[PDB]
Design a protein around this nucleic acid. Structure first.
Ligand SMILES: [Mg+2]
Ligand SMILES: [Mg+2]
Ligand SMILES: [Mg+2]
Ligand SMILES: [Mg+2]
Ligand SMILES: [Mg+2]
Ligand SMILES: [Mg+2]
Ligand SMILES: [Mg+2]
Ligand SMILES: [Mg+2]
Ligand SMILES: [Mg+2]
Ligand SMILES: [Mg+2]
Ligand SMILES: [Mg+2]
Ligand SMILES: [Mg+2]
Ligand SMILES: [Mg+2]
Ligand SMILES: [Mg+2]
Ligand SMILES: [Mg+2]
Ligand SMILES: [Mg+2]
Ligand SMILES: [Mg+2]
Ligand SMILES: [Mg+2]
Lengths: 234, 150, 138
RNA sequence: CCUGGUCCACCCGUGACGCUGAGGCGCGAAAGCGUGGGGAGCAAACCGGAUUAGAUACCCGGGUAGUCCACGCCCUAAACGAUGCGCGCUAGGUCUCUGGGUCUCCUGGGGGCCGAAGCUAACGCGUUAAGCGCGCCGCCUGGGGAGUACGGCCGCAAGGC
RNA sequence: CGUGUAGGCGGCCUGGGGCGUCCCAUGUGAAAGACCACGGCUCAACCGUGGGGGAGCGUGGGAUACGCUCAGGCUAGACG
């Protein structure tokens, strides 16, 4: 039920823009494309969950990240559907490394969240209205999934690590165990828990992000049907 | 909260239409004297401030100096930049002979019997960074044959 | 054409470990095996076996490295951090017994050919002999 | 027409016969020199014209050696990759020249760019290394004095070492 | 910039010698100084006794991995 799914349409990706480091996880080159061995991908998925599960059943928070369009929303869902922080927009720099300052801007989101429904709006010339509204708008726009826990995540899950290695550095400099879904466009080595697979076709992201968010809640109770995925899915 | 003693402080300067703005630099070492120490370099618009930051960074970046009689496990040499540093352990009851930088660092690291020697560039800053990466590379017969398992 | 196949060998290894690697294959030699036997026997490698690459005898030498680390640059520590040759083909470096070096305070090894086989800093000091100090490893 | 080097393929032959290389020897851009030809264009020098405080210059009109050839000298240089030669070893990517194959691919030599690891004072280097190692040759040891002096050797001289 | 003289440097295997090299034994390495002890002058400086070391070099014996040399073979460097 696993091998059938992925191998259904969820493996083999980046071609000849690879990275010789990530070669212990390759089978061959079909039609010019690098086709990644799934058989080993499993033995790694295993251990990757062996970690998630030994974390979800110990109540620790995880930070999901993906800022590339072919995988923005499909992570906005899975996260809320697991009640976990995430970053859908531009992953601002120094979020984790400078957690005391990026957080000073979430304490400003609610500073407008509680001056939103209020009797003080009666006043304030139209200048500060467009202003404090917009300010709220954007503040919101970037920090939708970045409020939740005011505390350094005990881990981080990520789509394309080399696409957002900036983050991976922050986490790594803090000692935050890193888990991610890398293809051949990425370098293993600097990821603690590896999910070798497709990273652009919106298929494979669902098949892996879902069963991950599912295995999250399987250590809490509430076994359900998967999340909203198909709408314009191909 | 440790020992905290500052190596050197310097005033630097940058040019700008109308004269020379400045800035001050502070190199600081930190230790409990058990085998814990950290190096910290901090620059800021003023003396007091800079020194503060120094300490903060110092604690951020500390190393497990593994003694073995108030001295050191093995003899080492390390080049960081144009600056070479030699570390040789002395028999108990000798003294910690070194220049300001290396000494400083080594006192709070809780050494008491060590031969040193700055070679190459004797730039304080780089002798600092030098010594750290030396200590940072200390091994005991334990952690040694700990890797020669198999 | 290689002058000191040994310093080579050792370099082959020094370079091998630098990026970490299953094995590396020095071309075979009844002296290079000798030397290697003391790396494994003293725990600097997994070992080695004979092989071949089209009629040509080599030594598959399986390296050894430390445990993965935390923080940035998570590459392991090295089992062999340092391996540099003493006696060179341009300056043979011989040593009497009381002259034998004390690598790194016992932590390292001074492999060295002798009148009675390839011993080491401890091994020879015991058998009470000396000879061409071949190299220092740690 | 005469001749050098050099790469590929077949694994056929010899069986370490190798690498480097003080001195020596040869070659060595331009200019320059000797003897003898040659002279269109260009052009040190030199003559004029402007400009200019002046203009032994830059711009313009002329113009001789020279630039060319044969034979003989001279032997210098930013003679530059400012990177001695040989060998082994340490990710790949890209385009380019030229070999070979059961040719959308692989492999061998060569020339470029970006770049792991590593080096580096930094700039940068990076299988065409400035990486990691062995061999052998050359060379550096603060600036000016000075590549000067003296001596020596070479050169017809200029001058060179 | 080449070519090359002397010189330096020398791939895999097997055996003979043992020159380098390594070990043991012994002669030599004066004393004074130095250095560790112990005392002699009130301490000390100076001074005595005793011990312990000293590389080298000669002599005898032994080992043979590496270097050298003689010998037999190989094809991975080199050449054809
Ligand atoms: Mg240096
Ligand atoms: Mg034959
Ligand atoms: Mg030659
Ligand atoms: Mg000419
Ligand atoms: Mg003429
Ligand atoms: Mg004219
Ligand atoms: Mg004219
Ligand atoms: Mg000439
Ligand atoms: Mg050029
Ligand atoms: Mg090429
Ligand atoms: Mg480059
Ligand atoms: Mg290349
Ligand atoms: Mg002077
Ligand atoms: Mg001069
Ligand atoms: Mg001159
Ligand atoms: Mg003269
Ligand atoms: Mg010769
Ligand atoms: Mg005496």
């Amino acid at each position: 039920v696993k091998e059938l799914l992925e191998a259904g349409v969820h493996f083999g990706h980046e071609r000849k823009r690879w990275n010789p480091k990530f070669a212990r996880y390759i089978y061959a080159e079909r039609n010019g494309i690098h086709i990644i061995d799934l058989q080993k991908t499993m033995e790694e998925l295993e251990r990757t969950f062996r970690f998630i599960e030994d974390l979800a059943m110990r109540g620790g928070t995880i930070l999901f990240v993906g800022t590339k369009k072919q995988a923005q929303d499909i992570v906005r869902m899975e996260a809320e559907r697991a009640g976990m922080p995430y970053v859908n927009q531009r992953w601002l720099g120094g979020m984790l490394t400078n957690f005391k300052t990026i957080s000073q801007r979430v304490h400003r989101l609610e500073e407008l969240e509680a001056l939103f429904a209020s009797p003080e709006i009666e006043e304030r010339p139209k200048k500060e209205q467009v202003r404090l509204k917009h300010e709220l708008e954007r503040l919101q726009k970037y920090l939708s999934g970045f409020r939740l826990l005011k505390r350094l995540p005990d881990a981080i899950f990520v789509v394309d690590p080399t696409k957002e290695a900036i983050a991976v550095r922050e986490a790594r400099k803090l000692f935050i165990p890193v888990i991610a879904l890398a293809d051949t466009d990425s370098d293993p080595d600097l990821v603690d828990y590896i999910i070798p697979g497709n990273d652009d076709a919106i298929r494979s992201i669902q098949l892996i992000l879902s069963r991950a968010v599912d295995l999250i809640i399987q250590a809490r109770g509430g076994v359900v049907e998967p999340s909203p995925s198909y709408a314009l899915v191909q | 909260d440790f020992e905290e003693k500052m190596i050197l402080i310097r005033r630097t300067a940058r040019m700008q239409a109308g004269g020379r703005r400045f800035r001050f630099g502070a190199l600081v070492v930190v230790g409990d004297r058990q085998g814990r120490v950290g190096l910290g370099f901090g620059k800021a618009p003023e003396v007091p401030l800079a020194v503060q930051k120094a300490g903060y960074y110092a604690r951020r970046n500390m190393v497990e100096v593994p003694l073995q009689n108030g001295t050191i496990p093995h003899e080492i040499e390390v080049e960081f930049g144009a600056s070479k540093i030699v570390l040789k352990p002395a028999a108990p009851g000798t003294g910690v002979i070194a220049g300001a930088v290396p000494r400083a660092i080594l006192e709070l690291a809780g050494v008491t019997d060590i031969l040193t020697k700055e070679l190459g560039s004797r730039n304080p800053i780089n002798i600092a960074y030098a010594t750290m990466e030396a200590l940072r590379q200390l091994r005991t017969k334990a952690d040694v044959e700990r890797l020669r398992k198999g | 054409m290689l002058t000191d196949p040994i310093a080579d060998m050792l370099t082959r290894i020094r370079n091998a470990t630098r990026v970490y690697k299953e094995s590396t294959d020095v071309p075979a030699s009844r002296f290079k095996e000798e030397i290697l036997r003391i790396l494994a026997r003293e725990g600097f490698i997994k070992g080695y076996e004979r092989v071949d690459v089209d009629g040509k005898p080599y030594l598959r030498v399986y390296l050894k490295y430390g445990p993965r680390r935390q923080g940035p640059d998570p590459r392991p520590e090295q089992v062999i951090h340092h391996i540099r040759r003493i006696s060179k083909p341009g300056r043979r470096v011989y040593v009497g017994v009381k002259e034998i070096p004390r690598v790194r305070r016992g932590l390292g090894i001074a492999i060295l050919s002798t009148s009675k086989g390839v011993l080491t800093d401890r091994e020879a000091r015991k058998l009470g002999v000396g000879g061409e100090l071949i190299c220092e490893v740690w």
